[PDB]
Amino acid sequence: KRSQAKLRFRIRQRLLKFQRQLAVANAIASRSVLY
């Protein structure tokens, strides 16, 4: 069961690194940007 947990560990590591990049594209799609 730990091998699937290591796969979840690497995906969460990939999204925690580029969290600030992905947060902007969701905010432009959700129209939430303070000009």
């Binding site: 690194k17 992905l22 947060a23 902007v24 905010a27 959700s30 940007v33």
Partner: peptide, 27 residues
């Protein structure tokens, strides 16, 4: 590096959006 400049610009609600809390994020 141009995309990370707008992270301080978004509202606090949909800021950390793939995770519910912002405490356990990368700081």
């Amino acid at each position: 590096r141009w995309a990370a400049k707008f992270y301080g610009q978004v509202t606090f609600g949909p800021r950390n959006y793939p995770y519910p809390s912002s405490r356990w994020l990368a700081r």
